[PDB]
Amino acid sequence: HALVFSYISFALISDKRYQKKEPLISSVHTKVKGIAEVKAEILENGMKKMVSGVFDTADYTFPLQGNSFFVMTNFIKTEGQQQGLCPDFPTARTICSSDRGCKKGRMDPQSKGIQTGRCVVYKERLKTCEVSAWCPIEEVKDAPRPALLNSAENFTVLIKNNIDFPGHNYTTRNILPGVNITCTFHKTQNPQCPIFRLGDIFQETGDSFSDVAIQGGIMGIEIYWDCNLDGWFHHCRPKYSFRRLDDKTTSESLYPGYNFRYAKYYKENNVEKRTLIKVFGIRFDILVFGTGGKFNVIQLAVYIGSVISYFGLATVF
Amino acid sequence: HALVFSYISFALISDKRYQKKEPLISSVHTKVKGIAEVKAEILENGMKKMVSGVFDTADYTFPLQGNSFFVMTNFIKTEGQQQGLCPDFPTARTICSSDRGCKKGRMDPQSKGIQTGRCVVYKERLKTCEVSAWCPIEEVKDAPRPALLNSAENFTVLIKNNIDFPGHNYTTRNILPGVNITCTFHKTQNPQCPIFRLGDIFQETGDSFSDVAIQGGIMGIEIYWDCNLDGWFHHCRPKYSFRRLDDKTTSESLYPGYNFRYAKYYKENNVEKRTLIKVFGIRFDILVFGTGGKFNVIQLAVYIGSVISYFGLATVF
Amino acid sequence: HALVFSYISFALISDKRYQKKEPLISSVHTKVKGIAEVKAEILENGMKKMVSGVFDTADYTFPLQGNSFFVMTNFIKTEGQQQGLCPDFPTARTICSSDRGCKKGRMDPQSKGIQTGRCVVYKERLKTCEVSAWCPIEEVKDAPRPALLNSAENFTVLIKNNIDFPGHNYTTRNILPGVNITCTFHKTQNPQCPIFRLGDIFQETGDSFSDVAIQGGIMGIEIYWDCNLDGWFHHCRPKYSFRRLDDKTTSESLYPGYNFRYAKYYKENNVEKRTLIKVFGIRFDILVFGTGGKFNVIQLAVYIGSVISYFGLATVF
Ligand SMILES: Cc1ccc(CN2CCNCC2)cc1NC(=O)CNc1ccc(F)c(F)c1
Ligand SMILES: Cc1ccc(CN2CCNCC2)cc1NC(=O)CNc1ccc(F)c(F)c1
Ligand SMILES: Cc1ccc(CN2CCNCC2)cc1NC(=O)CNc1ccc(F)c(F)c1
Ligand SMILES: *[C@@H]1O[C@H](CO)[C@@H](O)[C@H](O)[C@H]1NC(C)=O
Ligand SMILES: *[C@@H]1O[C@H](CO)[C@@H](O)[C@H](O)[C@H]1NC(C)=O
Ligand SMILES: *[C@@H]1O[C@H](CO)[C@@H](O)[C@H](O)[C@H]1NC(C)=O
Ligand SMILES: *[C@@H]1O[C@H](CO)[C@@H](O)[C@H](O)[C@H]1NC(C)=O
Ligand SMILES: *[C@@H]1O[C@H](CO)[C@@H](O)[C@H](O)[C@H]1NC(C)=O
Ligand SMILES: *[C@@H]1O[C@H](CO)[C@@H](O)[C@H](O)[C@H]1NC(C)=O
Ligand SMILES: *[C@@H]1O[C@H](CO)[C@@H](O)[C@H](O)[C@H]1NC(C)=O
Ligand SMILES: *[C@@H]1O[C@H](CO)[C@@H](O)[C@H](O)[C@H]1NC(C)=O
Ligand SMILES: *[C@@H]1O[C@H](CO)[C@@H](O)[C@H](O)[C@H]1NC(C)=O
């Protein structure tokens, strides 16, 4: 009976049911640092070409939108596209022996254009279905074998997180005043340090940064707040963890990795032209969750209300 | 009395109050497919002009930011704007009979410029208030009567959703391994299929895609997770539903539809110039909510605590 | 004993524990209005230059992404950058007396390039470490002393918020039909008016708009919904409040304010070139939280269950 008292009172103190919990409010602001020197040889349209240059912040990233930031790690670039009629790139689905294999007006999911219904030669005696689109069509090619921006492991993301509890009227931030900002977060050595290294993040979740960097991925940074708003035992600091949100399907149908197509439009010799750029990289999604607990009398009285009956019943035995 | 027992125990099992519920964590990744052939005749500056071309992914959409993606469906384009002094476009608010109707330095919400205080002729004998801005001012014109990108119904959005329950340590994803990816979601035939057709989405919520596509809108895709983390009766799959978030006010003051203005800057003959583009389209907002429930002894003991007293009182009658 | 009855029943009615509460679903759509005339004298590369022009929506803002919109308020612009070898900008960390102070291949966090290991003259007899990057390197300079877009206080943000409660199946919006849209929100005079003035927002939270506008900041607009879904006492309207999320650290290490670097790429004389633009401004983060309460019998029965025992114990005294 008395042990039932100590187990009830303990279950209260341990589950903090005397306290009232409120969901956290998060605001995220990120600043990425690091530059990458890129020298690589890429085969474009069957001809060897040299990609050289230095990439800084403006070249490979943009500001965080919606509690997430992206870092480009690789890219394929098709230049000089213009509105016109060209043979689709030779694939299992685009190759015609005769004009009959091509259907006029047909649109294919793999194709970036609308067929004209006429079989044409893409190169040599190989024939594909002529299409109307931005010409020439981007090659169905693989990403560069070493990620051009493979240096992105050494890049550094600084995270500033502000969390508010309205009902308890308690506002705090990720970074406290006076903390030594010159640190790299470590699971043990500097768990509070907001400075993060991307490669470190990938190792923590057990993934190689380079591999993901070749085709792209979606990493995830979790910030946990177990915040206790009582003056007796008070605590409210974040706990950083890392999880890979990327599906890692590795199936052509599921469109694996993270990549997107964006174009830059220009005019030349009184002709509208466009440079298509396939972009591969790791999107980092910041997930901040929390709970704020401050003692509430009504909740304690309701638990008391369950406990009184629990006690009578324990006495009955 | 005994029926009070079966109704209490039933109310427990039915409300699952033996279980503890935890809020879901959602990450969203989307890939849009489809291309649109656009041939239309648009009246620009009182002269007929022909808009022709093929639009692919890079031409009409950009990657999802903040659990939402946008698809352009129509656009008005004003080209060659440069810093200068020009008469405002003739409206009810911009027309002056004399230099006195124009106030120097005045800014109007409808106007894109600052008045110079001088009445000038916009065309013929019609006079408007001269303003300082990007010239010439975009016409106060309606969107193209058929949406140029009216084909966007036939476009296809693939959604990959990853949800995590930290406190229960349970991570799952929208798309399971081995599922037939070649499907279009149907309310009955393929409710689990993540492939979605935009026109289907509009029909489900009872709106015509074309109409919204002319002036823009905000559609909403709801993903519900009623996830039960007990091994006895286990279940954790999404339920897709569609709701129109757009306000549909249809009042000039409320700025109805979804549209925005963005510009491309270029130089010509040593003069800075800019192409303003009004963009209309449907923004799709993905809303994922969920609840994960796994049996908890303390919660069951608290409900027990309410129930014991409820029982004594039922015996009193 | 009876006062314990009135205090229990009161605690119920006051905490509404008869009701069941459900978390709110928010969708945000914003439209910004206002234009700014910018005339200012900026010292660029040690030479005086004149910035003049009119800025409209497309020039200083872009559409909301992830329940947040940004308004540029100031900017520094470095033009003509091209891939090459140039001396880093003279700072405490970049200045070399001899070729020995520079380490070949070294990358510094303050530097935007990779050192070649050779000491060179930046200007006159002052020597910095030669680096490989976009040349010339942007000056380590302060933002313009008056914010070029200092007029942004007078700018107007219109907010349309749609909130849904799925479990209660109740959908409502921020803006009701027939409301006088011609208003500016006031703490007292027009608390429901969704039209907001940015300067008003800064005064409400007790910050000067101009100061923040010089170096950038992150403002926050909170929308509270205390929604009661019972027909007896029904209410469901928003309560707007303003909080400054910006950390206001004012330390060079913490990267204070809100700013980002973005570039525009062009070709000249068969040379790839780039215009780097440092952008300063206030990001406004919209935070919508809410709770919907509709009477639930099971919850009332559980509270009853605590209360019956509470009553027996009160009788024991
Ligand atoms: C994509 C790219 C390719 C080549 C080069 C340098 N070249 C050209 C000059 N000479 C050296 C070699 C720079 C860039 N970077 C950009 O264009 C910036 N745009 C951007 C694209 C996607 C993003 F995700 C993002 F954040 C920002
Ligand atoms: C807006 C536009 C107008 C005309 C054309 C083709 N023209 C020009 C060549 N000849 C054929 C006719 C293409 C585009 N598309 C873009 O500029 C891409 N930019 C963009 C704009 C808003 C978006 F929402 C978005 F996702 C991406
Ligand atoms: C940055 C800037 C500098 C100067 C001028 C006008 N100049 C040039 C013509 N003559 C007058 C003086 C316009 C703009 N605005 C843009 O380039 C628009 N891009 C943009 C940049 C950041 C943003 F946050 C955003 F929302 C949009
Ligand atoms: C990252 O830095 C280390 C140490 O400077 C270097 O050894 C490594 O090669 C760098 N990573 C890449 C991809 O170059
Ligand atoms: C929150 O607490 C502070 C403590 O100083 C107080 O000044 C402030 O008024 C409180 N907030 C509200 C909304 O009352
Ligand atoms: C921060 O720590 C580093 C080494 O971890 C040290 O070199 C530096 O002086 C410290 N800064 C301060 C302000 O204590
Ligand atoms: C969508 O596809 C169907 C079938 O191919 C076609 O009949 C319809 O016209 C298409 N929609 C538009 C807007 O062209
Ligand atoms: C979550 O469960 C898995 C089950 O294998 C376990 O390996 C993992 O360590 C658990 N997570 C934590 C944080 O303990
Ligand atoms: C998927 O279903 C389609 C028809 O609905 C069928 O043609 C196709 O072969 C199926 N794929 C697999 C792998 O079963
Ligand atoms: C905002 O408008 C007021 C009234 O027109 C004006 O006095 C003030 O100077 C304006 N703000 C700026 C920064 O010009
Ligand atoms: C929500 O309530 C309305 C009331 O008219 C009803 O028509 C609708 O079917 C309800 N929603 C669901 C999912 O039943
Ligand atoms: C709205 O209020 C303003 C003044 O606050 C008034 O001038 C205007 O006529 C009102 N509009 C309507 C429709 O009542």
* Of A268, A239, A288, A315, the residue nearest A66 (C-alpha): A288
CA of B75 to the centre of ligand 2 (A): 9
HEC string for chain C: CHHHHHHHHHHHHHHCCCEEEEECEEEEEEEEECCEEEEEEEEECCEEEEEEEEECHHHHECCCCCCEEEEEEEEEEEEEEEEEEEECCCCCCCECCCCCCCCEEEECCCCCCEEEEEEEEEECCEEEEEEEEEECCCCCCCCCCCCCCHHHHHCEEEEEEEEEECCCCEEEECCCCCCCCCCCCECCCECCCCEEEHHHHHHHCCCCHHHHHHHCEEEEEEEEEEEECCCCCCECCEEEEEEECCCCCCCHHHCCCCEEEEEEEEEECCEEEEEEEEEEEEEEEEEEEEEEEEECHHHHHHHHHHHHHHHHHHHHC
Q: What is the DSSP string of B93-161?
A: TTB-SSTTSS-EEEE-SS-SSEEEEEEEEEETTEEEEEEEEEESPPP--PPPSS-TTGGGGG-EEEEEE
Q: What is the DSSP string of A210-264?
A: HHHHHH-EEEEEEEEEEEE--SSS-B--EEEEEEE-------GGG--S-EEEEEE
List chain C residues with CB under 8 Å of A306: 305-306, 309
> Quick one: which of A294, A286, A33 has its CA closest to A161?
A286
Beta bridge partners of B197: B156
Amino acid at C159: I
Q: Which residues in chain A are classed under CATH 2.60.490.10?
A: 20-294
Helix ranges (H only) for A55-166 are: 57-60
Phi-psi region at A248: left, alpha or beta (left = phi > 0; alpha = psi -120 to 50)? left
Q: Which is it for the CA torsion B125, B128, B129, B131, positive or negative?
A: negative
CA distance A96 to chain C (A): 39
Report residue B125 as tokens: 């004998």
Phi, psi of A247 (to 5 degrees): -75, -25
Dist CA B151 CA A105 (whole Å): 14
CB contact set of C225 (below 8 Å; sequence gap of 6+): C24, C163, C236, C237, C238, C239, C288, C289, C290, C291, C292
Token pair of B127 as six digits: 């006079």
Distance from CA of C184 to the nearest CA of B (A): 14
Name the residue at shortest CA distance from atom 3 of ligand 4.
A154
CA distances from A210 to A118, A149, A152, A279 (A): 43, 9, 9, 16
In degrees, rounded to 5, the angle at the alpha carbon of residue C28 between the alpha carbons of residues C22 and C34 is 150
Q: How was this structure obtained?
A: X-ray
Beta bridge partners of C127: C121
Residue A189 near ligand 6, beta carbon < 6 Å = no
Residue type at B85? L
Burial C117-150 (b: 16+ CB within 10 A, else e): bebbebeeeebbbbbbbbbbbbeeeebbeebbbb
d(CA C150, CA C210): 6
Is the separation of the CB atoms in B292 and B171 below 8 Å?
no
* Burial tier of C168 (Cβ tally within 10 Å: 0-12, 13-18, 19+): middle
- Residue B157: name the closest of B290, B25, B283 by CA: B283
Residues within a 6 A CB radius of ligand 9: B 180, 182
Which ligand is nearest to the Cα of residue C38, counting in written order? 3
- CB of A180 within 6 A of ligand 6: the answer is yes
List the 141-160 stretch of C: residues with Cβ below 8 A of A.
none
- For residue C306, give the nearest of A37, A171, A302 by CB distance: A302
Residues 187-226 of B with CB under 8 A from C: 218, 220, 222, 224
Q: Where in chain C is the domain with CATH 1.10.287.940?
A: 1-19+295-317
What residues line ligand 7, using a CB cutoff of 6 Å? B 150-151, 153-154
Show which subunits contact B, needing at least 3 CB pairs below 8 angstroms: A, C
Structure tokens at B145: 């009567």
Which amino acid makes up residue A158? L
Residue ranges of C 32-91 with Cβ closer than 8 A to chain B: 33-35, 37, 52-54, 56-59, 62-63, 65-68
| Phi, psi for residue B101 in degrees, rounded to 5 | -70, -20
Ligand 4 centre and the CA of A182: distance in Å?
Answer: 20
What whole-number distance in Å separates Cα of residue C209 and Cα of residue C71?
A: 12
C-beta of residue C254 within 8 angstroms of C-beta of residue C247? yes
Q: Are B191 and B239 in contact (CB under 8 A)?
A: yes
Tell me: is residue A259 an annotated ligand-binding position.
yes
Q: Which residues fall within 8 angstroms of residue A281, CB to CB, at 6 or more apart?
A: A60, A70, A71, A72, A73, A74, A149, A152, A213, A216, A258, A259
Q: Which of C243, C239, C258 is nearest to C205 (CA)?
A: C243
C20-294 in CATH: which number?
Answer: 2.60.490.10
Using CA atoms, how far residue A142 sits from A61, A103, A261, B258, in Å, is 22, 28, 14, 37
Superfamily designation of domain B1-19+295-317 = atp-gated p2x4 ion channel (1.10.287.940)
Sign of the torsion angle spanned by Cα atoms C276, C281, C285, C286: negative
User: Which residue from B minimizes the CA distance to C67?
Assistant: B66
Please tell me the distance from the alpha carbon of residue B173 to that of residue B169, in angstroms, as a whole number. 14
Q: Please state the φ and ψ torsions of residue A194, each to the nearest 5 degrees.
A: -80, -20
Q: What is the DSSP letter of A147?
A: -
Asked whether the beta carbons of B136 and B126 are under 8 A apart, the reply is: no
- Residues B236 and B163: their CA atoms lie apart, in Å, by 10
In angstroms, what is the resolution? 3.3
Which H, E and C letters describe B166-222, residue by residue?
CCCCEEEECCCCCCCCCCCCECCCECCCCEEEHHHHHHHCCCCHHHHHHHCEEEEEE
Task: Pick from C265, C267, C272, C273 the residue to mutate for probing ligand 1's pocket: most ligand atoms within 8 Å of its CB.
Answer: C265
Q: Is the CB of C69 under 6 A from ligand 3?
A: no
Using a CB-CB distance cutoff of 8 angstroms, which residues of chain C are in contact with residue B312?
308, 312
User: Are C312 and B309 an interchain contact pair (Cβ–Cβ within 8 Å)?
Assistant: yes
Q: How far apart are CA B168 and CA B181, in angstroms?
A: 30
Task: Record the tokens describing residue A226, joined without a space.
Answer: 């177990």
